[PDB]
Amino acid sequence: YKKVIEPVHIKIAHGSVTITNKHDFITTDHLLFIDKDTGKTIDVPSLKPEESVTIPSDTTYVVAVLKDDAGVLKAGHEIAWGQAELPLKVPDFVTETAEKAAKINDGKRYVSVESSGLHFILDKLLGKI
Amino acid sequence: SCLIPENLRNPKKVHENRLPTRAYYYDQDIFESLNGPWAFALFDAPLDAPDAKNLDWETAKKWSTISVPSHWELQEDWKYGKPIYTNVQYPIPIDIPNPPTVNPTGVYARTFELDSKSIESFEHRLRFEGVDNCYELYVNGQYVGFNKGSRNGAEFDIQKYVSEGENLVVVKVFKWSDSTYIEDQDQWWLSGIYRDVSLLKLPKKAHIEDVRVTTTFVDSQYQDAELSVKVDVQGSSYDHINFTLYEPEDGSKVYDASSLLNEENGNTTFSTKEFISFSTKKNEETAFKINVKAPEHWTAENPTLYKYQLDLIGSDGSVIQSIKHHVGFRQVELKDGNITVNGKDILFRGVNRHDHHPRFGRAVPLDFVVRDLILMKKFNINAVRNSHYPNHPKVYDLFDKLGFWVIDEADLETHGVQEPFNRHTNLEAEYPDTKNKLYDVNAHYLSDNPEYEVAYLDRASQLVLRDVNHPSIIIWSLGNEACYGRNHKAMYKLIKQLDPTRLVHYEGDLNALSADIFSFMYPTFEIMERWRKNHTDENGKFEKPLILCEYGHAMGNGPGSLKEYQELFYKEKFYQGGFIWEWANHGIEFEDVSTADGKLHKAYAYGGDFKEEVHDGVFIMDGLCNSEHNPTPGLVEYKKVIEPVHIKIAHGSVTITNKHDFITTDHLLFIDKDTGKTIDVPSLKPEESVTIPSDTTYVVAVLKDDAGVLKAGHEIAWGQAELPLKVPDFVTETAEKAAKINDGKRYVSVESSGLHFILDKLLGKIESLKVKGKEISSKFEGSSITFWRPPTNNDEPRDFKNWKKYNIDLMKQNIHGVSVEKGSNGSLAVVTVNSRISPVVFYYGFETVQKYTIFANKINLNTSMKLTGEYQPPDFPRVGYEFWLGDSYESFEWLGRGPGESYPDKKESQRFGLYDSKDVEEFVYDYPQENGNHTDTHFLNIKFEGAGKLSIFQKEKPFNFKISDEYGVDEAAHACDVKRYGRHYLRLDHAIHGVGSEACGPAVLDQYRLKAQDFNFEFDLAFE
Amino acid sequence: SCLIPENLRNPKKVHENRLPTRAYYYDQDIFESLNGPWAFALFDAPLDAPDAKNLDWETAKKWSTISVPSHWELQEDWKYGKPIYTNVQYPIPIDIPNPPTVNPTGVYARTFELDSKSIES
Amino acid sequence: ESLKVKGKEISSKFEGSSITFWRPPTNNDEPRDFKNWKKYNIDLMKQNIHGVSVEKGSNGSLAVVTVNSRISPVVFYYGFETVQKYTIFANKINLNTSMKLTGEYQPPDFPRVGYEFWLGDSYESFEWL
């Protein structure tokens, strides 16, 4: 719920961060915007209700946080955030394809595959490892 | 050493400009609270902190806020560091009187508003109830003063510095100073303004500064009393004082958290039932003495109070100021070598209580202290020791109203001076009659150091003068573990000078050269007994009594042998009881990664968890209550041993002895639990007894009506007739049934109708036993009979070392021969297993014979174990079987001690009865260790879903059992670290080692030790 | 102690039918190596091991192989357990002269070919 | 904090004290010497500064910085009244170290005594006689 009702929208696409103030009355001036990829703050102009700004940036992840203690909230409290969409990258695991002899036993019920560092048994009756 | 400020390294600089200590009284009309959010910044050391003479509110305004009162090591996300636990060792280097140069400095700032009329009408003060370690105070950019003494209060005159409108308060707080050396209690190191801050507005022209109330009996017969009231009024513009004493409210008054904490006055009419009035006359002494006609005695068992109102009255006849408080008519004396209250030689049923809260630390809300005290009363406690410093001033009224004998203790421990000595000389043990010679050698650093005299005296002066009007305080204590020196004598002289009405305690002063009482901690009975005899003369007279200011160390599973201590207390007039160490574990709530789970869990921190350079580990976890301040089995056991009424049932009789000090048994309802009907018991005075003939087995003594903080029906005491071990009338099936017996190569099989028994001959292991739909099997790792338990805190220093050394956890069963024969006298088969049970690497072990006699519906298991070989261990943790319970397993029920756990030297609070596992909340230890054993078990029923029960009993002697799914307890640091199997097991034990208090105190007593010897025992496994 | 075989618990049973010790000399013409892969199976204790008086090559043939010479605690993937290091302490209980009843037993098997002339020569 | 002379930078490797005494225990250290050193908290030696004196150079030096401190581990009395005198030249820094052993309950020996410095990013190799 805290996320969907966040009073500031942060959108990251096409080398840009678009920040829209979605409060009813207050500006964004009390908030510190951090580029989470570098840890350094982004200088964001004071935005009124419904005003927005597009800032060009290489960032992936931006957080909007409280500058100082205010009300019952502490400095550093997270009001809003945004992320650029993360593409699914295939991890660079290296499959061992070297020619290693393997002992294969296709028994009555159980099938066995044994090699160096490997032991695989499947129950043919059940489809069970 | 100019890089460390002068005042932080000067033991004589105890304060600057602090007002003299006066008796504490809270007044809603005078006290304005300055608690709440304050601007705050932390600095590495004093030189990084701003000069407060130039700090604006506009500058400070911009800082983060912290809430006062609180410790700065206990903040959201550990923003300002973490707690540090040390017992003895100082967390700093010793270079008296220098603190480290790197010295965390917190600066606090807030504002408050002042009226035009306020400055005209009132003298303005600031009062700080407690700040750790010390601080300087500024108002409106101007230096007001300085203060030391972390658990003492302080007031400062603010009138000169105050302005109309906005006023600025700045407090510079330092973590270390010369004072650190005398504040080395076994507790968490925590800092900050951790107690209330208040703005006091006192009437300007004249006001009540101090009051002194004493009640002294005129007579040897403790009837008529002199009430003395001395008032110190400040200023000229007053006429006289009025005093009104009201009719008493009996100590049996009902209280709750709400009425105890109610702070309302002003327009609330205090009381009406006038008993005595008195007026001073113009220009005369503002003090008086009046004779009071046979007043109601104040006692811890009956805390009867007379409310009073004291009015300062002007020339026009109006009330300038009022004090509303209470008088407790009581007198403490050292009389014929005993501590005596109202002519009576009392017994301490006591406990040591630190200020501790699992989230707030030493910043304990009053609500929570009330919670503590109610709980104490509910568990038969009558005395509290303020280990080792005064509490929040508002707590002492709670003692007055609820009724506790209180030892109020100076904030002074010097223990750390000993640590290098302990290590340099490889010191292993300290003993109460002998140990003071070890402290003597290092006394010169602090307690015998003339530079510290002013500080030691100040701790004394501050202790007494703030709390001097509370009838519940009967003893002042000079501190704890600060060796013995000239400064202690100086403290003693001052206290007797300031308050002649009470006695002085100091355990470090072995021979009581400057104390009125003898005091031991954790002594053996031998040591108690020698002391008695050396201080009892030929006549049978003694000059001073002995108390145990600390005994029965309550760390983890324990303490053992509270019974034997109590027997000693009642037997000799020389012993006046003691105080358990301690009330509660000092655990701090935090988030721990689980060893069982790989996930984050709520847990309670001790040393090491906050990653301290140096720490003392689990030694902070030594309470009768857990970190969350709830009763452990330790407290349950304590309530029983200290019960103030004895109920003995033997020979068709109930003998009832009143063991209170003052009150009768009249408020108690005695119930015959076998019939539910009450027993008419005559009114018994202290030490009186009556024998009543009855057929009863079980008698309970219970409260007739709500009284104090206890409810009608609350159990004070109980007694049972001893229960003989009856063989259950289970019917063994001995009918001739053919049985299929297969004695294979490795496995032996016995099959019959409703029965399947498989034994692995190679291991001595029951692969499976399935009788009438119910299944068990051996829980086997090395041996079918195991000896190990997860070491308790008490086991750790010695017994565990021995058991580990002798490889008791690595016991192996080596099978020699298995014999299989057809049944004879109704049995289906006899399987006999011959083996040696012995750990790897050792000679010692048991020539073992396990005979399984198998019936259709029962299995008889006869175990013979014969101890053989050189180099044996002294004792074992336990000896018994471990069985996996089948998937069907659902609950258990037993005849024996309950509802909770019991151990040989910690069992008598668990009365005999039939108990159901479902009715019991299993106790979770904060530090995982041996738990959940049930001793003196007559029989055990284990229920299987839709298959009836398995009944288990031992021949001729009751047994021990545990049923759980837990493992990895040894390695588990916290409750969340405990691993759990996918099924339950039964730990079925012939015997189990006692529990003791050896973490700090005597070893498990000889008659409770499971000594190395032969074992012979027979079990029946009877299937429904 | 009949669940542990007599010869494993008899200090005097140093050997049975071993030839007397003689000075060692390697000779290529006399020594034929039997090193290489051998059929092998591990058992918990002697009583689980097969009676060798009835063990065929056809039966043993089907087992996994281990290479001789080698330790069985030093195999691919620790197939047959791991090494144990003790200095002084015995890794077993002391009950001289008994070994533990649980006593890892490895059975090795292989074949070799013999000539008509070889047995004569 | 930093010493940068002619493009070369060093600084104190600091955890508690500028003069440290600890070494990773050898196998030979383990049974006794390590036990002693650990017992006496030699790994937790702290340097507590008392005074720092700063004066203009005299015989060709640029400045003289004198540090007065106690070097002592937590929880113990024993330590060294220490004087560290830095005489600073344009191309050289002379460091005079005086350490005076004081206090009751002293350890028998130390693993070592000396300074620890971080080498600057430029660092590439070393050479010694």
Ligand SMILES: OC[C@H]1O[C@@H](O)[C@H](O)[C@@H](O)[C@H]1O
């Ligand atoms: O649990 C250990 C306890 O030992 C006592 O000697 C001491 O007075 C307590 O403050 C506490 O340290």
Ligand SMILES: [Mg+2]
């Ligand atoms: Mg202590």
Ligand SMILES: [Mn+2]
């Ligand atoms: Mn944990």
Ligand code: NA
């Ligand atoms: Na401490």
Ligand code: NA
């Ligand atoms: Na007594």
Ligand code: NA
């Ligand atoms: Na403790």
Ligand code: NA
């Ligand atoms: Na544990």
Ligand code: NA
């Ligand atoms: Na060895």
